[PDB]
Amino acid sequence: AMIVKEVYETAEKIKSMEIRGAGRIARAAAQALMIQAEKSKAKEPEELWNELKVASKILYNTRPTAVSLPNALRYVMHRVKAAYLGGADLETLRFTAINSAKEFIYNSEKAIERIGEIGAKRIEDGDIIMTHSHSKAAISVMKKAFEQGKNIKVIVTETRPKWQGKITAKELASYGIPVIYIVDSAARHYMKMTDKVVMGADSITANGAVINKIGTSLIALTAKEHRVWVMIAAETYKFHPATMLGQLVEIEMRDPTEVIPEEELRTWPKNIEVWNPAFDVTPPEYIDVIITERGIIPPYAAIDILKEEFGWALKYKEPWED
Amino acid sequence: AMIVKEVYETAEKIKSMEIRGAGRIARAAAQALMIQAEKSKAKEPEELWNELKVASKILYNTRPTAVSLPNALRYVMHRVKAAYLGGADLETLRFTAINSAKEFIYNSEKAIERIGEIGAKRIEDGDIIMTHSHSKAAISVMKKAFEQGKNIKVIVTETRPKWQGKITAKELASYGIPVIYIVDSAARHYMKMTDKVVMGADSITANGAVINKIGTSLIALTAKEHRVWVMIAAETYKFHPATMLGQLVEIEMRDPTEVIPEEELRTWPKNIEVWNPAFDVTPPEYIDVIITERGIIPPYAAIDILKEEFGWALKYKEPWED
Amino acid sequence: AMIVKEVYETAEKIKSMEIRGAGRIARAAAQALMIQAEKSKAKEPEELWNELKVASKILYNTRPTAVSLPNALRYVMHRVKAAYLGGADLETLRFTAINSAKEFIYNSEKAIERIGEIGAKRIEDGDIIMTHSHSKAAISVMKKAFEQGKNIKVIVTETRPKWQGKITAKELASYGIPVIYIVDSAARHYMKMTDKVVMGADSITANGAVINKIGTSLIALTAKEHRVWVMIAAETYKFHPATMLGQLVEIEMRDPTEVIPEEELRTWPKNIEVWNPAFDVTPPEYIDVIITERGIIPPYAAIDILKEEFGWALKYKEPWED
Amino acid sequence: AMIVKEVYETAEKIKSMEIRGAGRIARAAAQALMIQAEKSKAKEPEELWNELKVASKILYNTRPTAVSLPNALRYVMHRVKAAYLGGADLETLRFTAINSAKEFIYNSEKAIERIGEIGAKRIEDGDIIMTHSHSKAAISVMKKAFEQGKNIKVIVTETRPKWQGKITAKELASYGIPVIYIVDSAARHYMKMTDKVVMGADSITANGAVINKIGTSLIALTAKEHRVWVMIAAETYKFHPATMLGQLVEIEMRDPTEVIPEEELRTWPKNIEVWNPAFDVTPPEYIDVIITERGIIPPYAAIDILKEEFGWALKYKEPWED
Amino acid sequence: AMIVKEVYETAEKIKSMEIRGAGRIARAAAQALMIQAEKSKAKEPEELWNELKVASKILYNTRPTAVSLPNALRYVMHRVKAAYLGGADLETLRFTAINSAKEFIYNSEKAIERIGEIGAKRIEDGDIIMTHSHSKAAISVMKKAFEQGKNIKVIVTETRPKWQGKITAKELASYGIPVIYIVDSAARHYMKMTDKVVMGADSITANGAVINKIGTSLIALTAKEHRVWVMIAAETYKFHPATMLGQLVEIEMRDPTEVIPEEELRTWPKNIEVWNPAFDVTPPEYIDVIITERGIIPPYAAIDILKEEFGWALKYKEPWED
Amino acid sequence: AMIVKEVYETAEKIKSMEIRGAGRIARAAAQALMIQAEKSKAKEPEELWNELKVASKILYNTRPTAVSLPNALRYVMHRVKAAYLGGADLETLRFTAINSAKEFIYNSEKAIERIGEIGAKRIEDGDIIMTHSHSKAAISVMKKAFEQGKNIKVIVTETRPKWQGKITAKELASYGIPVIYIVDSAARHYMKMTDKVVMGADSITANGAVINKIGTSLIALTAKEHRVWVMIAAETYKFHPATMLGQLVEIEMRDPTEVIPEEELRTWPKNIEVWNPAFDVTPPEYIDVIITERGIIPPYAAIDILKEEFGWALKYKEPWED
Numbered sequence A, B, C, D, E, F: 001a002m003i004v005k006e007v008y009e010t011a012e013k014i015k016s017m018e019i020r021g022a023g024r025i026a027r028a029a030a031q032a033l034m035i036q037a038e039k040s041k042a043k044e045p046e047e048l049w050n051e052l053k054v055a056s057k058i059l060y061n062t063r064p065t066a067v068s069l070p071n072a073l074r075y076v077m078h079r080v081k082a083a084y085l086g087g088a089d090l091e092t093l094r095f096t097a098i099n100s101a102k103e104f105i106y107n108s109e110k111a112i113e114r115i116g117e118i119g120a121k122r123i124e125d126g127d128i129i130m131t132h133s134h135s136k137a138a139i140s141v142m143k144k145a146f147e148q149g150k151n152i153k154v155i156v157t158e159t160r161p162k163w164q165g166k167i168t169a170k171e172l173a174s175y176g177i178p179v180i181y182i183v184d185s186a187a188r189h190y191m192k193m194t195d196k197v198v199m200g201a202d203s204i205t206a207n208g209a210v211i212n213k214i215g216t217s218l219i220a221l222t223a224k225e226h227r228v229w230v231m232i233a234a235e236t237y238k239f240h241p242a243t244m245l246g247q248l249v250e251i252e253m254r255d256p257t258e259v260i261p262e263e264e265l266r267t268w269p270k271n272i273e274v275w276n277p278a279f280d281v282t283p284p285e286y287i288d289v290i291i292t293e294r295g296i297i298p299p300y301a302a303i304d305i306l307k308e309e310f311g312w313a314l315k316y317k318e319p320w321e322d
């Protein structure tokens, strides 16, 4: 045991979505391991190692679907583990954890700035862009395009149940970007006036499928019907290593009361069930490009990003297992 | 000029959606004419006739998209106009208005029952049915399938911005039918487990397109993707005669405060526009059948229903114009 | 109650597929009703009427999927019933039965000849044609185009489990048409070289779907994939009136021993089940035209054949019912 | 014999395409029969009848693909024939021919004006319309839309080999309509900025296929890919009766030297063949509506226009055969 | 010149399909080369080298379509050839042959086990799986998912003309997996109820096409129609190196008497030809993933398996050539 | 600053299309640098270097869309820049420019031959091949197929506005190959009889899209519709490196007088604009393979060619910028 309160508070804030967005959650988890190592009262390497193992498990068991979270945890603990097994002493192990965490956080920020600069080259002056949910990676693209002087407009879908569209609409409007807010249902009706679709990712699989906020796959479907480019802005740590060896991504089922508030739901007949999937799966055929910090790829090149950057680890257990 | 308060009240309630659903609005318009004729203090036929024309205009000018409304007005008013011009006296004209209105209302009730009987024969034991918005015609189908003892389950989409799915869920649950409630964005995600889609219509056009609650076209699109039958339950007075001669159906744009309540919306910046189309257009390639009170048709036979039942009137002006 | 042995022979032969093919089965039922009438030793009209109702039920209950059978029984019995109810005497009723039967039989032959003539105009010199099962209407198209001097070749699919393709291969070779015989599985491999697909039908529904020998829909699907014309050759009595009011066509499931001979099947373990659907459903989007004895139609005009030839009868009970 | 020179000159001008456009050719053929009857020196009904038979055959054997030509001929000669067989005398037969011709010509003009008014309701302010070849029916639609004050632009495809696009571009520009001229190859590249496609027809078949100028089917294909409405403006006399009974429309193969001028072609190697099909076939699935003078139809309703207006004649020989 | 009888037995058994299945055939060829080496009575290395070149040619020339066979021969002979050319003595060369053969055989077994493990993670409790032919790699996926406690059912297609489905049905039943056996023609009818499709492969090409038992491509086509996952279970030695430099894979045509027994076939007329393709080509757009022993890939990454595992060898002649 | 006349002449000829075809233009640009270095009167390395940079800019600024040009310039100029900066003397820098240019030219010639050899293996005896514009790479494929004795016929599309098909027709005829010449609009009409499509490329992008002569995308579209293979013959220097980082490829808009000659065009009204894009974009879903000098790839592996061969240079500015 001996876990710092910031670890428990971060885990709780991921679970409740007080902190959300797959990148933000990954950085928050890195930031928690960092604070555990900063404040630990461990005397021994053995002790701190075991704390970080435990902190890591607590953070992993918060929300399952966005692989950014375990990838952040892995980034920090592959390096902490290797230091430990190599015989590092207390302060060397501590610094390894703190510095790996800071590396992940810095690289996450840079990757998003770079995704914006790359994706903005695909955005043309006059473009109407449709988006979904709230993705910092997607917003980075739209924001850089606007800063380049391209006169754009963003159609923002409200993204039920949690209303993520409101966040997006207000953020974009605050940079000076003109916004059209519509309900999710209206996505097809307005796909004809749309030039480009720019969305985020929580996990991208080996076969090129993108797992993102519920409703994503519908927008991609009708963008494809209408020949509107579907561009997924996503960091390489959105790529899902275990899909290489056949693993299915768990789709997170969140609380019914996030759809129908508890005051109302309790009055409803028992033979109504409310189902609240937080994500869906978009097949690669409905995706034109994935914009990563290292460049544009077709969706079927996702296996390459995973082979080159993640494959080596799959013959090992997780770096926080005993 | 001497218009009774019920005509005004009916109209206000149509505009505000306190009275809603295509068939219901049609019935209420006929009723309101019925009441104008029952309570008229007119002493001459010309004077009654003039009241019925003005009331028809008030009722016509409430909500555009659902052709059931003008079709109801025409049902009554063609018969009223023929009687006025053939020399009917006051009491004869009055009765023609009342009785035509009654016929329209009664025929509407029977047509929804018959649609149920016919559609229910396409529902099989164990079917998972997805629906959208709240359609009395679609519900008649599902209710009758259940009464025949077929064990069905209905996936009900929330139907933002007005939350029509709530109505549908509770109504279907009340008859004994299990319901799964989902946000609109989840319709693709659950199309794999769906056997049948059953929705209603506000207007059906000469080439077989169905105009229905915003989001309908998305559900039909992914249904077709998945080889799930799309059935549209629709009375013959949902068919739109002006489309035979090239008319485009106006899609109603409703208040943005139905999407974002006024308190919230006034705090938003000027450069976010909220757009709130109440309907969309589903093309005929994504519809398998239309279930009318006269039987099952491919959507491409919408023209036949229009020719044989409404075409005759297209050489004439509206039966309420001077 | 006094049913001649020929009715029972006919029913048994229909059941075992010793008599088969939708047109033939229909003709045999009309034949059976004719012989019941000829050989009846009834003395009063009611006693003959009872025999004919009962013989019709026996015939109707043999094989459910091809509607040609009940359309034949109806052709006769509508006429017999109307005669009986107008107070027809015994010999008048007898002869109505016999003459209505003869007339269905003659018209069926003529219809098949005329489908031949109309269908052959769509076959072009040099054409390679793929067929499925053994359909006398389809063979009529092919035999006629060859008689006009067009150098055609026909690809005959084996049509498991009953090997219908063997019947078709031998018949077509017998007229001097060169045949390529292939297993069903090869239909896609050879679709590239196929110019036209020509198949029959057992029932055609109000929305334009064609129910025909199991496998038909696979062939139509890859035909449409390859932009190869799919032409269905079908008499007007293959159109299914009950589908206008929502009825589903029942797919006959036949004995598993037609797939795996009993001698072999009883050695197999109990946890292997053999499913033997005799028909499948091809949707109308994969059918280019239906060739009837009255002309070429798009599949979507099946509802017109039905409205015009059969819809009158739907408001009544079956003419063999009490 | 005894055919007036205007018959030979008209036939020659159809063959050389000095007169072209399916409507114009049909009116020209009517106008020729008219002038034969006006100027004939026949003494006897028998004589004039036989002249008109012969005039008719000369006109029919000019160009095969646009059924407007035989339909015009039929319009005149069904009535001339019936008069003759009914015993009409010389001047009565003469007037029957002259008046039938004038009827056809007047109705053709009205049908085109009416097609424009109907189709223009489908054109929206701001629309970019793409067209192909030169169709008076299509131009009628675009012209009426512009006269209504809709700010439109027409993308005109050049329509090789004969450059019909130039005619269209100059005609539209002369009404004040802004035009973009592009090569045929550029149709896909500009389909994204296109709102609507409006083209003509030479023949429309029973199954809903449209035969129009070579390249039509490509534009329809990519309009369908991009969800751009394909609207075919066409008079009911563009509908092809013999397709009801299985007839394939001949695709006219015009002279190689219309593609490669003779001065150049003679210098080319003998193993180059130039193929010059004047038309192609557009499947109904790629057509949204057909706009006739009697209203909007889906393409699959073409069989109805043919059943109701032309079927009765198919059991007779042509009205100019012996 | 001195080839042991086991090489000839193996070749004959491959030819007659007494030994069959792409992996098995490959293992048997490696086995045959091993035994030639063990039993050789050669005294010099050149004499053994000559025997092994010749035995390889004998084996290569049995059945052309499955590349597993030449990839096995290559695995051994590349190694044997390199040993020979480095001046290996007789026993060194013998043992290189024997040990290279053993090693291909062991790795093949391991690969199939591991495909099982990786593929099983994509099968979910409750799944209905459709397969085709008899593939040990596909069966490995299915047997493992069942061993993990997932309640699956498998739909086995008959796989004419050789009835491979019987082998598969009995094998799967033997492990306690419930089986539904159907004719090939029924694959579309039952695709609605199928959750996953899992098949093997004989060769996989550089652009991602899968050549497998005749019928495979029909199944994949209607699977994609219905949004059912198509998963191909295939060892890395099913990838076809020669296709990287443009080679087409030859489709074996086998004896017509495998379709129609000789006893029956010689009674048939000469103008019926029986075509018996053993394989067909499924394009990569209809394949969701390939499961190899090194992981899951999109079909489009077949070129990477090839570049990385085999492309080195392409600049040389076959290792059994002179 | 002292630029030789050949650099200027080369540039004029590129702009005017007296020199055209992607590979040819690349070769001519390398040649022009070669000549500048051969004839330079520079006395210092800096001075030569400056000449080569200015010449590179002049050559770069001729025509945008075909990346072969800048790729050729880079080939030479990277090597020149590395030599300048590593201290090379005048004669060493001169030779580096000459010899790099020679290598590029020689490698281009070999690559087109190799592409022929590889592509020709996908062409089968009796194939009808459709091509578009004039591509040396595509022609190498067809020429080699013929030399192998495969009896092929080539459908050559006219390729307006510049009539490139004329060149193609005459060239292919000269080698012995029969040709059918058609207008671009006829490509769909003849896609039924086509076995293979073989075209070239000007640029291939990171996601697998091919930019090629205007109209290419239409032919690929209807080819896919028809299950006709679309093969793109393209050297690795057709691959576009800037697209890895989001760059959009500029489509060249050429003089309208290439479409309508100047004499005609000046007589046209102001409100006709002639638009003349020289290229379009074909998406990767409509391409089956790309045939490079290193082998056959799916279009989705374009990224691999870009990564391994061009990616290294993207951190640096152009090797001709100051």
Ligand SMILES: Nc1nc2c(ncn2[C@@H]2O[C@H](COP(=O)(O)O)[C@@H](O)[C@H]2O)c(=O)[nH]1
Pocket: A205, A206, A207, A209, A243, A247, A248, A249, A250, A281, A282, A283, A284, E227, E228, E229, E288, E289
């Ligand atoms: N549901 C799901 N599909 C996945 C996953 N990883 C890859 N896929 C692939 O994503 C595709 C989904 O296609 P769909 O079924 O949505 O139309 C399939 O090809 C499937 O094999 C995963 O974790 N979950």
Ligand SMILES: Nc1nc2c(ncn2[C@@H]2O[C@H](COP(=O)(O)O)[C@@H](O)[C@H]2O)c(=O)[nH]1
Pocket: B227, B228, B229, B288, B289, C205, C206, C207, C209, C243, C247, C248, C249, C250, C281, C282, C283, C284
């Ligand atoms: N299974 C079935 N489908 C029918 C019947 N009548 C009409 N259909 C129609 O056939 C089509 C089947 O399309 P599929 O689901 O096979 O892709 C649907 O449009 C459905 O409405 C019937 O009796 N059975």
Ligand SMILES: Nc1nc2c(ncn2[C@@H]2O[C@H](COP(=O)(O)O)[C@@H](O)[C@H]2O)c(=O)[nH]1
Pocket: C227, C228, C229, C288, C289, D205, D206, D207, D209, D243, D247, D248, D249, D250, D281, D282, D283, D284
């Ligand atoms: N070529 C041709 N097709 C016709 C004609 N009449 C109807 N069709 C129909 O038009 C469609 C053409 O489809 P496609 O082969 O172009 O993709 C087919 O369904 C065919 O049966 C005709 O005269 N010629």
Ligand SMILES: Nc1nc2c(ncn2[C@@H]2O[C@H](COP(=O)(O)O)[C@@H](O)[C@H]2O)c(=O)[nH]1
Pocket: E205, E206, E207, E209, E243, E247, E248, E249, E250, E281, E282, E283, E284, F227, F228, F229, F288, F289
């Ligand atoms: N028939 C055949 N197709 C191959 C082969 N290698 C790759 N392919 C590819 O397989 C695909 C076949 O698609 P289909 O024509 O069956 O619709 C094409 O994209 C083609 O380029 C081969 O050896 N044979």
Ligand SMILES: O=P(O)(O)OC[C@H]1O[C@H](OP(=O)(O)O)[C@H](O)[C@@H]1O
Pocket: C020, C021, C022, C023, C024, C066, C132, C133, C134, C135, C136, C137, C138, C164, C199, C200, C201, C202, C212, C213, C278
């Ligand atoms: O009426 P005709 O055109 O001969 O055949 C129509 C259809 O009826 C047959 O069914 P079965 O063999 O009786 O099960 C075949 O499926 C055939 O296509």
Ligand SMILES: [K+]
Pocket: C191, C192, C193, C194, C195, C226, C228
């Ligand atoms: K074909």
Ligand SMILES: [K+]
Pocket: E191, E192, E193, E194, E195, E226, E228
């Ligand atoms: K399914």
